[PDB]
Design a protein around this ligand. Sequence first.
Ligand SMILES: C[S@](=O)c1ccc(-c2nc(-c3ccc(F)cc3)c(-c3ccncc3)[nH]2)cc1
Length: 351
Amino acid sequence: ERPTFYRQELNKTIWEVPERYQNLSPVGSGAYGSVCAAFDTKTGLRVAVKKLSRPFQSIIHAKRTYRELRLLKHMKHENVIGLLDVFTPARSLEEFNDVYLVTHLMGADLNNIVKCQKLTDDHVQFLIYQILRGLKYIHSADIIHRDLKPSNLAVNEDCELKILDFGLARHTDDEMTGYVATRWYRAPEIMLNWMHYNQTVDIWSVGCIMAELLTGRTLFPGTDHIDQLKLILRLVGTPGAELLKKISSESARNYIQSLTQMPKMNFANVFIGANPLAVDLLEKMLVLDSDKRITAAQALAHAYFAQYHDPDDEPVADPYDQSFESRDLLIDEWKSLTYDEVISFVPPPLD
Ligand SMILES: C[S@](=O)c1ccc(-c2nc(-c3ccc(F)cc3)c(-c3ccncc3)[nH]2)cc1
């Protein structure tokens, strides 16, 4: 590495980036840092360059920073966000304090394309197909997204989709109160912390997204946790003895049982006029018991994606080492590991 870095101040934010990145224009800011749009002269792509505020200000922040880089450094799939570059103007680990992440500039998210209508079956087939393809890859690496929602799905003009902003990072809390979309896509068990969730929590999310692409309406727009749980059970039915056994909190089990029992509803009478195939997949995705939900790899083989499925074009990931997740390190140690990951970044090829 080590090119020539030039520095400038845009929106009172200092940016020290290599010369390959030109014509930087602020495009977002916040506690996390700031994001810029720029032109990458070496790849010819319009990229987003994110400058992380002060990444090593606590053991938890330095950890989340290490986690983000590792995650992004690992993701190599067409339908998943990838890392184009990572740099720091620092010449040594001593002065290493700033981390910049560079990725393809994402324009519109799914929450724009759809919020503006109810789509055609072929569009739903395609968009959900890609979400599942990327999810098969992610899950195959033992990664659970945990926060799949329209706003976390970049979609271009050609209806090509990429899975973004991974949940794996920021502790699940704070912004899930009330009438908020940040919770309408969550599986009941992760939402009410009934049990230790598995990868199928992401599948429940795809179902919510898919159903919303078909009807043009939010499937479970609860005004709060309980109101949402209620909406869910009305459609999916209340838990039975088998699932109840798996809910660990005794008050949670006690609460569930205070509810009048309800049978699963007829989905064809909910998703009126939808491709029967779409209806069937939804029923296999929105299953209360996470253990009986369909897996991404299984969903891809569903007759609903007959027009796009090709087992030879749905790759899985290289093994992802998350041992660090259980490692007990000091800030400087998380900071050193991050630096190593930065220093060692090898760019994706141009072809
Ligand atoms: C925690 S906060 O709400 C927050 C919001 C946005 C981002 C955020 N981080 C990136 C971003 C930049 C470079 C990368 F390599 C990876 C992600 C983007 C981005 C990606 C593609 N096109 C436009 C913007 N948005 C990070 C934190």
